[PDB]
Amino acid sequence: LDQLRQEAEQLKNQIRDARKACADATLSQITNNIDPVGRIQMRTRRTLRGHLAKIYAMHWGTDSRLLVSASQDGKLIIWDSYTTNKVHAIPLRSSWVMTCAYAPSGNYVACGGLDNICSIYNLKTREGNVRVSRELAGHTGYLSCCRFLDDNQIVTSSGDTTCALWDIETGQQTTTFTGHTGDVMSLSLAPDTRLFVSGACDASAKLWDVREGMCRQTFTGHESDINAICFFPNGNAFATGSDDATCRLFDLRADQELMTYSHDNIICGITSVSFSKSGRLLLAGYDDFNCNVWDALKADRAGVLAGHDNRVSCLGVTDDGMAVATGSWDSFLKIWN
Amino acid sequence: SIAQARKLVEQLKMEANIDRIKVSKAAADLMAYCEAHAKEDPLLTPVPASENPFRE
Amino acid sequence: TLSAEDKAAVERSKMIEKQLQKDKQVYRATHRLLLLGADNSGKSTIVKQMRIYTSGIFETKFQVDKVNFHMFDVGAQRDERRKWIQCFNDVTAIIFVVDSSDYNRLQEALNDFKSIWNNRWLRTISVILFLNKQDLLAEKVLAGKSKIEDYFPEFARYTTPEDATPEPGEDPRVTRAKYFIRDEFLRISTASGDGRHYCYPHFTCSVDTENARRIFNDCRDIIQRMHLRQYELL
Amino acid sequence: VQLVESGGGLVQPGGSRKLSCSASGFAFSSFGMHWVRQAPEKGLEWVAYISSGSGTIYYADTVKGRFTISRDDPKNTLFLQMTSLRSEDTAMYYCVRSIYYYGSSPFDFWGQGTTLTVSASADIVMTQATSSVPVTPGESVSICRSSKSLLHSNGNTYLYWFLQRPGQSPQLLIYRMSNLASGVPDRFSGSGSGTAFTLTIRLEAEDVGVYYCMQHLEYPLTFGAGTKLEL
Amino acid sequence: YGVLGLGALLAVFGNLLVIIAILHFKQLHTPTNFLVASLACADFLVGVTVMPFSTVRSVESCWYFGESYCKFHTCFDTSFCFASLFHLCCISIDRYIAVTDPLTYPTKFTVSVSGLCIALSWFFSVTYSFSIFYTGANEEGIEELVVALTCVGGCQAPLNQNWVLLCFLLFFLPTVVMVFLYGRIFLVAKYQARKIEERKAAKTLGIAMAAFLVSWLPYIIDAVIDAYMNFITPAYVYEILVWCVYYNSAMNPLIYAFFYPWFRKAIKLIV
Ligand SMILES: [NH3+]CCc1ccccc1
């Protein structure tokens, strides 16, 4: 064992020096005088009440009109974001849930929390009720996130270090991703559904391959736990948010850190990060009761989403870019535009 | 631990053998995507209320 | 100005909101408690006594004087609790069971208790501290084979305070030792209370005729002090 | 999802009768319920409507005030009480379930009447152009009767296309003129112009039967005259 | 003018804040805060409707605005000037349920109950008033009423002996509940400050009980005995007495919903 660390350190710092040689110009210098986005004014259009406890996660539908949110009182509610009507309200078996996902096909919703179980609900069925279809129980840690791949494929992230690809029909995990050293907190799928990135409590982010169980790449730029990760619409870059008032941009090709979105006036820690449809705007939700708007190419604060009472927990931008939703711990969803 | 540490080196090494392109090329790539999709995103360009479904 | 279908859409949303209101009644009339501690401490014995009288979360229900309590015991989970503890930010109280029989773990327990008390997401949350298996503690100390001063070399200098109120039938040696650990836990509790949360230690045992009643009286005090502080009275 | 209808029988011209539609296999408490009449030698017409939870109730102006529609969720049964029957009310009755939310498909399940034979304005009219068109397997058949623009401000159309297999209950084919109902093959593409509509089909051997439409924009639900396809 | 005008501005400017900053803010939609909104509405109506008209009445010593105005101006004054007291009585019951029985505060104090206190506070305080000024049960002996009140002019709503006691008893009950439910709380909040090892409980309860007693009590006390010991009390020394209760209604939104930090914190987020 003593003959391994000596050469592992040499390999690691070789990687480090090759990485240093790879980069030659800061992206801030490249995008130095192209265009400022200017001040951005966004205001509430609808406010969605009806959640008893606080809410942790929410996911936009693909039709850009429906969204689903999960609360600490054990409730899944599907909204009509146009007419504010409550399309569906689902009671959960476990009151502690930390994530929810909406299927791209629009007929499946999934949730899971401190029960180490990811449950699947089918919205459209011959009978007039939303019920459980499959209960994936193979983890030994709380589920931190989940994302649908198709109508029968899903990837889950657990408090247990492993990330697992599942198979709804057979109810068995096809592939297990074991590369981290702590608890994976978030995972963001690629637009082509071929390579997702996950962030953990070890300040490290890893790009994976769905076809096999191989960790393709690893990024380490932060010092605290990684709390939220998002993928750039182009599919060749991604931004993350950690518990040190900092957001960073990594490129899956250059393998560097491009910008550091932070300000001396911020002490709180990020909770959710999302991108605009064009990728020009970065939206980050903080713990100081309000979200923020960042210029993804100039690294400036160009907008604040002031209205919220408690800490924001989930943030998201709809597929067509019409609006951005925002949940928080005061149990109110606000659609901004 | 006689082979769990060897697995770490085996993985790290296979990760070490990848191709890295210049960071300026990546910067140009993101800038080009942003310019190409600039005139479509209704978040920076305030959409008028006629076809904005979020009003009143 | 709505179609004949949108009228029935709004009607459905009203009956969703009506059912949510009915569910707000049960949610507001129940108190949620979180069990914590270590493996040696007889938490399973505690939950088995009330319940008779890779899941990762176990919930048990008990109600005394027509008010419902729900206790959530964390099941199969990893050692680290940094992340999933911020979720329990609205419980009324934490029930922190501790075993007093063996002396090696006591130092470990103080490390566990100190981190929970000083946590950022658990301020304004009071701890109903328990000391369990007290009968076995008496047996070990009266035998005298195992000393206390070897682990904590202050058992000799320290003397039982006048505030101690022991029942008849117990020698001073048991009372001197029993109240020594209780003050050790409180030594770190008083430092960071900061007029927000309070500790309510007890001296329960493995099998007890009544245990929930201690939680009832502590919970009533816990929120009575919260309301009084809220109305600028306390 | 299978609901049966009970009642019927020989009745006197002036008496009373009770009609029941007992639901089973679905969450009956979250479904609006309608009643639709179908004359022995004519088209189908609306009768009544009771919302889920009995919040709102409408009636047909033809027999308003002589009929009552009531629910029973505990027992999952629907009732219709008829008083002072006349010769016009002689037909077969269908209880049609429908649920209304974003993306729903109302009027999807009907259920056939079992021995349901009985004895003796500013609306929208949907008199279809034809009543019979020759059909052979291989060629499409299609034929718009709207006295008002069936296009609300939201963007929908509110035209439902039903098909009547010869000898049993109708079925839903297309709702809102562009949405194909579940459980039926490719029978329509999506075409309409606010006031003119058509239903283009390759014809198989089961398509024979009446083929009429409906309106849902305003409170009265007026059906089409009826188009038939024969081999 | 002058002092009287200032009391009118406070009763509307200092009260509009409470009624505006509850409906608009969803952070303050607690069932206990809806009672404060109703109390604010009652005080605002006092400030807009009965106070401006009574201002000129107290500076010209005559009812210039005819007689119907009077037959009407008095009855609703007695109606919803005594509806401010029921709100205080019910806020006291609130505090008592919150403190004495802390395990079941959200269980008993739902919105359904705070909605039943507003209806009682608004309708009962009115149906007894409008049945006294108009029906004529206010005066059983009118011969003495005419000479002192009508011929000289002005309106002061004198009450006869048989019914003045009833008037008093619709201030005694709104006051007996307030002090009994604050005597117990003072003790409870005393034994719990010694348990920790008092100063703040006495100051807070003192203001919430001295403000009410220093205004409503002096006026009603002199208004209940004036139907026994003839009417020796001068008319001119009665304007201050009627204005004291008006003063009380102006400070109400200040003792409640302004002395607490949870309201100032929520209202400081304007900019
Ligand atoms: N400011 C006078 C209000 C009033 C007068 C007499 C009885 C009750 C109330």
- Residue A171 gets the label, from left (phi > 0), alpha (psi -120 to 50) or beta, of left
For chains B and E, tell me whether 3 or more CB atom pairs sit within 8 A of each other.
no
CA distance B21 to B24: 9
CA distance A34 to A297: 9
Do residues D110 and D94 make contact, with C-beta atoms less than 8 angstroms apart? yes
> Exposed, middle or buried by CB within 10 Å (0-12, 13-18, 19+), for A13?
exposed
E82 lines ligand 1 (CB under 6 A): yes
Q: Does C26 touch chain A (CB under 8 A)?
A: no
E159 lines ligand 1 (CB under 6 A): no
DSSP state of E161: H
Tell me which residue has its CA closest to atom 7 in ligand 1. Answer: E78
User: Which of E178-204 are b and which e, b meaning 16 or more Cβ less than 10 Å from the residue's Cβ?
Assistant: beebbeebbebbeebbeeeebeebeeb
CA distance D174 to D106: 10
CA distance D230 to E235: 101
CATH number at residue A52: 2.130.10.10
Residue ranges of alpha helices (H) inside chain E are 3-23, 31-45, 51-60, 68-80, 83-100, 105-108, 111-127, 130-133, 143-145, 161-196, 199-213, 216-224, 239-255, 261-267
State which amino acid sits at residue D205. A
Beta-sheet strands, E only, within C37-142: 57-64, 67-74, 93-99, 126-132
Task: Give the structural domain span for C57.
Answer: 31-230
Cβ under 8 Å to A: D residues 11-30: 25-28, 30
In a mutational test of the D interface, the residue from C3, C14, C19 whose CB has the highest number of chain D CBs within 10 Å is C3
Tell me the β-bridge partners of D16. Answer: D83
State which amino acid sits at residue C224. Q
Specify the 3-state DSSP secondary structure of C5: helix
CA distance D227 to D213: 9
- What is the distance between the terminal CA atoms of chain A, rounded to a whole angstrom? 58
CA distance E177 to E212: 12
CA distance A317 to A307: 17
Do residues A238 and A252 make contact, with C-beta atoms less than 8 angstroms apart? yes
The distance from CA C90 to its chain's CA centroid, rounded to whole angstroms, is 14
Task: Residue A168: name the closest of A132, A203, A207, A197 by CA.
Answer: A132
Q: Do C232 and E107 touch (CB under 8 A)?
A: no
DSSP state of A16: H
Question: How many distinct structural domains can be found in chain C?
Answer: 1
Q: Which residue of C has its CA nearest to A118?
A: C55
CA distance D30 to D21: 16
Do residues D160 and D174 make contact, with C-beta atoms less than 8 angstroms apart? yes
Tally Cβ neighbours within 10 Å of residue A165.
19
Query: In this structure, what are the phi and psi dihedrals at residue D74, rounded to the nearest 5 degrees?
Result: -45, -45
Q: Does E33 touch chain C (CB under 8 A)?
A: no
> Exposed, middle or buried by CB within 10 Å (0-12, 13-18, 19+), for A216?
middle
**Ligand 1 atom nearest to CA at E246:** 1
Specify the 3-state DSSP secondary structure of A291: strand
Q: Do A47 and E27 touch (CB under 8 A)?
A: no
CA distance A54 to C34: 18
State which amino acid sits at residue A232. F
Do residues D211 and D224 make contact, with C-beta atoms less than 8 angstroms apart? no
CA distance C99 to C46: 12
Which pair of structure tokens corresponds to residue E69? 């105005």
Q: Which residue of A has its CA nearest to D108?
A: A126
* Pairing of β A163-165 and β A153-158: antiparallel
* Pairing of β C126-132 and β D4-6: unpaired
CA distance A268 to A262: 11
Do residues C219 and C232 make contact, with C-beta atoms less than 8 angstroms apart? no
CA distance C142 to E178: 58
Q: Which residues of C touch A54 (CB under 8 A)?
A: 90
What's the sign of the alpha-carbon dihedral E173, E175, E177, E180?
negative
| Tokens 């027992």 belong to residue | D75
DSSP state of C190: T
Specify the 3-state DSSP secondary structure of A331: coil
Polymer length of chain B? 56
Q: Do A49 and E26 touch (CB under 8 A)?
A: yes
Do residues E2 and E238 make contact, with C-beta atoms less than 8 angstroms apart? no
CA distance E191 to A174: 63
Which pair of structure tokens corresponds to residue A147? 């994302």
CA distance E19 to D130: 65
Output the CA–CA distances (angstroms, integers) from residue A123 to A117, D23, D28, in the order listed: 19, 21, 17
By Cβ distance, the residue of C28, C219, C232 closest to E259 is C232
CA distance D230 to D107: 25
Which pair of structure tokens corresponds to residue A304? 């604040």
Tell me which residue has its CA closest to atom 8 in ligand 1. Answer: E78
C25 lies in some domain = no
CA distance D173 to D181: 5
Resolution (A): 3.0
Task: Residue A47: name the closest of A329, A326, A318, A235 by CA.
Answer: A326
For chains D and C, tell me whether 3 or more CB atom pairs sit within 8 A of each other.
yes
Which pair of structure tokens corresponds to residue A57? 């996660």
By Cβ distance, the residue of E95, E192, E193 closest to C231 is E95
Q: Which residues contact E100 (CB under 8 A, 6 or more apart)?
A: E184, E185, E188
Q: Do A297 and B30 touch (CB under 8 A)?
A: yes
CATH number at residue C113: 3.40.50.300
E248 lines ligand 1 (CB under 6 A): no
Q: Does E160 touch chain C (CB under 8 A)?
A: no
Report the binding-site residues of E for spermidine: 77-78
In a mutational test of the B interface, the residue from A31, A82, A253, A324 whose CB has the highest number of chain B CBs within 10 Å is A253
Residue ranges of alpha helices (H) inside B1-56 are 4-16, 23-36
Query: In this structure, what are the phi and psi dihedrals at residue C203, rounded to the nearest 5 degrees?
Result: -135, 50
Which pair of structure tokens corresponds to residue C229? 């502080």
CA distance E216 to E173: 13
Show which subunits contact C, needing at least 3 CB pairs below 8 angstroms.
A, D, E
Task: Residue A239: name the closest of A283, A200, A201 by CA.
Answer: A283
State which amino acid sits at residue E82. F
Minimal CA separation from E25 to chain A, in Å: 10
Q: Which residues contact D163 (CB under 8 A, 6 or more apart)?
A: D170, D171, D173, D207, D209, D210, D211
H/E stretch holding A285: strand A281-285
| Tokens 């009533």 belong to residue | C220
Query: In this structure, what are the phi and psi dihedrals at residue B3, rounded to the nearest 5 degrees?
Result: -125, -20
CA distance A38 to A200: 34
Question: How many distinct structural domains can be found in chain A?
Answer: 1
Tell me the β-bridge partners of A76. Answer: A70, A90
Q: Do D27 and A129 touch (CB under 8 A)?
A: yes
Do residues A56 and A99 make contact, with C-beta atoms less than 8 angstroms apart? yes
* Pairing of β A153-158 and β A281-285: unpaired
Q: Which residues of C touch E260 (CB under 8 A)?
A: 231-232
Q: Do C11 and D101 touch (CB under 8 A)?
A: no
What's the sign of the alpha-carbon dihedral E117, E118, E122, E123?
negative
By Cβ distance, the residue of C28, C31, C234 closest to E200 is C234
CA distance A313 to C232: 31
Output the CA–CA distances (angstroms, integers) from residue E97 to C228, E90, E102, in the order listed: 12, 11, 7
Do residues D202 and D164 make contact, with C-beta atoms less than 8 angstroms apart? no
Do residues C61 and C69 make contact, with C-beta atoms less than 8 angstroms apart? yes
Which pair of structure tokens corresponds to residue B8? 């770490």
Q: Do A86 and C55 touch (CB under 8 A)?
A: no
Distance E59 CA to ligand 1 centre (A): 19
Q: Which residues of E touch C18 (CB under 8 A)?
A: none
Tell me which residue has its CA closest to atom 3 in ligand 1. Answer: E78
Q: Does C79 touch chain A (CB under 8 A)?
A: no
Give the sheet arrangement for strand A131-136, strand by strand.
A97-102, A108-113, A118-122, A131-136
Do residues E92 and E9 make contact, with C-beta atoms less than 8 angstroms apart? no
CA distance E49 to E80: 11
Q: Which residues of A touch B50 (CB under 8 A)?
A: none
Task: Residue D50: name the closest of D105, D91, D95 by CA.
Answer: D95
Which pair of structure tokens corresponds to residue D182? 């579940």
Tally Cβ neighbours within 10 Å of residue E139.
19
By Cβ distance, the residue of C1, C8, C14 closest to D32 is C8
**Ligand 1, pocket-test mutation among E73, E75, E77, E85, most atoms within 8 A of CB:** E77
Output the CA–CA distances (angstroms, integers) from residue B45 to B39, D125, E123, in the order listed: 8, 46, 54
Tally Cβ neighbours within 10 Å of residue D9.
10
Task: Residue D5: name the closest of D38, D42, D30 by CA.
Answer: D38
Which pair of structure tokens corresponds to residue A232? 């750039």
CA distance A219 to A144: 20
Do residues A246 and A259 make contact, with C-beta atoms less than 8 angstroms apart? no
DSSP state of D222: P
CA distance C114 to A336: 43
Tell me the β-bridge partners of A174. Answer: none
C202 lies in some domain = yes
CA distance E233 to A267: 68
Distance E226 CA to ligand 1 centre (A): 14
Q: Do B37 and A277 touch (CB under 8 A)?
A: yes
Q: Does C15 touch chain D (CB under 8 A)?
A: yes
- Residue E154 gets the label, from left (phi > 0), alpha (psi -120 to 50) or beta, of left
Which pair of structure tokens corresponds to residue E181? 């439910």
Distance E15 CA to ligand 1 centre (A): 21
**Ligand 1 atom nearest to CA at E81:** 3
3-state DSSP percent of chain B in helix, strand and coil, to 5: 50, 0, 50
CA distance C2 to C4: 7
Report the binding-site residues of E: 77-78
Task: Residue C77: name the closest of C99, C57, C50 by CA.
Answer: C57
State which amino acid sits at residue E50. V
Tell me the β-bridge partners of D214. Answer: D160, D223
C12 lies in some domain = no
Give the sheet arrangement for strand A291-295, strand by strand.
A272-275, A281-285, A291-295
Distance E184 CA to ligand 1 centre (A): 29
Distance A214 CA to ligand 1 centre (A): 84
* Pairing of β A66-71 and β A281-285: unpaired
CA distance D45 to D91: 10
What's the sign of the alpha-carbon dihedral C156, C159, C164, C170?
positive
| Tokens 């409008």 belong to residue | E130
Task: Residue C39: name the closest of C112, C139, C137 by CA.
Answer: C112
State which amino acid sits at residue D164. Q
Query: In this structure, what are the phi and psi dihedrals at residue D159, rounded to the nearest 5 degrees?
Result: -125, 125
Which pair of structure tokens corresponds to residue E78? 């007695």
Q: Which residues contact A39 (CB under 8 A, 6 or more apart)?
A: A302, A303
Q: Which residues contact C6 (CB under 8 A, 6 or more apart)?
A: A83, D154
CA distance E160 to E224: 9
E243 lines ligand 1 (CB under 6 A): no
Do residues E25 and E266 make contact, with C-beta atoms less than 8 angstroms apart? yes
CA distance A148 to A110: 8
State which amino acid sits at residue D94. Y
C149 lies in some domain = yes
**Ligand 1, pocket-test mutation among E168, E244, E245, E246, most atoms within 8 A of CB:** E245
> Any idea where the domains of chain E sit in the sequence?
1-271
Tell me the β-bridge partners of D38. Answer: D44, D92
Give the sheet arrangement for strand A66-71, strand by strand.
A55-60, A66-71, A75-80, A86-91
CA distance A273 to A188: 11
> Any idea where the domains of chain B sit in the sequence?
4-36
Which pair of structure tokens corresponds to residue D35? 């009643």
Give the sheet arrangement for strand D57-59, strand by strand.
D57-59, D44-50, D32-38, D92-98
- Residue C70 gets the label, from left (phi > 0), alpha (psi -120 to 50) or beta, of beta
CA distance B20 to A30: 18
Polymer length of chain D? 231
Cβ contacts of E158-163, under 8 Å, gap ≥ 24 = E158/E226, E158/E227, E158/E231, E159/E223, E159/E227, E160/E227, E161/E227, E161/E228, E163/E132, E163/E137, E163/E138, E163/E139
